[PDB]
Nucleic acid binder design. Structure first.
Ligand SMILES: O=c1ccn([C@@H]2O[C@H](COP(=O)(O)NP(=O)(O)OP(=O)(O)O)[C@@H](O)[C@H]2O)c(=O)[nH]1
Ligand SMILES: [Mg+2]
Ligand SMILES: [Mg+2]
Ligand code: NA
Length: 327
DNA sequence: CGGCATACG
DNA sequence: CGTA
DNA sequence: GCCG
């Protein structure tokens, strides 16, 4: 078992679901406390279990696995012996965890804002609604739409949305393309949002595109919220339902076609997979990876990629299709 | 011990 | 600060 | 919290 998540296939469904979920609770709680290192270790340990070919049934099966030390092994031990880990259950029922989870789930609220509201004594969404002077416009939208945004987006919703985005994109710039990315490209059946990547086959034609797309979507009455030169938009869309509609989060990103493989890789995820890939690139290969390219700081040169396959090959990694990037 | 991904709005 |  |  290799130490980096980008070195091994990780399928969406696997054989250690309960164990990984418990470790991910501890990872999330570490993040609420501002402990990024402990969040990463618990996330990486959970992801190792997702990559295993069969269920862990005995503690000895953790020997030699990366990211399993005394703490993560003790968590697994208690789950195997008792079906429950006392530390995990203590986190689950704690007021701090439940409130931080509730607040950070709001669009426009991160850990730092949630923590400040917690320290001020706020605990519920209605507590926030009662003091709307203290909310940004983005947070007001996140709070108004919170119920709809808490409902999973279905894969059967996604095609209809892609069609309306393609219509606006085609008027904004004929020949521009829309690619589904994010969790749905990795095979998820649900999601918290829909992520799209937009480009055009002629380099440079995509400049200035996203404002033109957003104006057209807004003119069609489909935009419940957006931030408005820009190349990423984090919106709330009106999605039709039987006799009504629901609010859905939609992310749009524009990239020049020269950068498209890097952008597709970056926005397809998973989040942990991309952090691990960027860490691998820098620490093992001495190359700097982001959503725009792959930089050799010694030569001061960028690697020209025509595909995701190119990028894996340039990093010396076996290719993983999106469905195996569910770290 | 240092390090923990990276950038845009 | 938020967001991906 | 764990790795190198
Ligand atoms: O902090 C982040 C968040 C997101 N991303 C990249 O953006 C992609 C989309 O980010 P996302 O937040 O839409 N997550 P996703 O995997 O689609 O699952 P869901 O919760 O169902 O929407 C992720 O899969 C990562 O590739 C990052 O690189 N860093
Ligand atoms: Mg998504
Ligand atoms: Mg997204
Ligand atoms: Na949030």
């Amino acid at each position: 078992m290799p130490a980096y998540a980008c070195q091994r296939p990780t399928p969406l469904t696997h054989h250690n679901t309960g164990l990984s979920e418990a470790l991910e609770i501890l990872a999330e709680a570490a993040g609420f406390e501002g402990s990024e290192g402990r969040l990463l270790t618990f996330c990486r340990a959970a992801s190792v279990l997702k990559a295993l070919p069969s269920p862990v049934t005995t503690l000895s099966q953790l020997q030699g696995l990366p990211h399993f030390g005394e703490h993560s092994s003790r968590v697994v031990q208690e789950l195997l012996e008792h079906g429950v880990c006392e530390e995990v259950e203590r986190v689950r029922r704690s007021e701090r965890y439940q409130t931080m989870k509730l607040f950070t789930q709001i669009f426009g609220v991160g850990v730092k804002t949630a923590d400040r509201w917690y320290r001020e004594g706020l605990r519920t969404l209605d507590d926030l609604r009662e003091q709307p002077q203290k909310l940004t416009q983005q947070q007001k939208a996140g709070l108004q739409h919170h119920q709809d945004l808490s409902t999973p987006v279905l894969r059967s919703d996604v095609d209809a949305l892609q069609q309306v985005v393609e219509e606006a994109v085609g008027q904004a710039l004929p020949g521009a393309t829309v690619t589904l990315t994010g969790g749905f490209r990795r095979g998820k059946l649900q999601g918290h949002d829909v992520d799209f990547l937009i480009t055009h086959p002629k380099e440079g034609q995509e400049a200035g595109l996203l404002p033109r797309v957003m104006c057209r979507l807004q003119d069609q009455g489909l935009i419940l919220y957006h931030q408005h030169a820009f190349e990423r938009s984090f919106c709330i869309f009106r999605l039709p339902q039987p006799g009504s509609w629901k609010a859905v989060r939609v992310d749009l990103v524009v990239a020049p076609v020269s950068q498209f493989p890097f952008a597709l890789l970056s926005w397809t995820g998973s989040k942990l997979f991309q952090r691990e890939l960027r860490r691998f690139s820098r620490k093992e290969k001495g190359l700097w990876l982001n959503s725009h390219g792959l930089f050799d700081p010694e030569q001061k040169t960028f690697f020209q990629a025509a595909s995701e396959e190119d990028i894996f090959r340039h990093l010396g990694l076996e290719y993983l299709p999106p469905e195996q990037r569910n770290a």
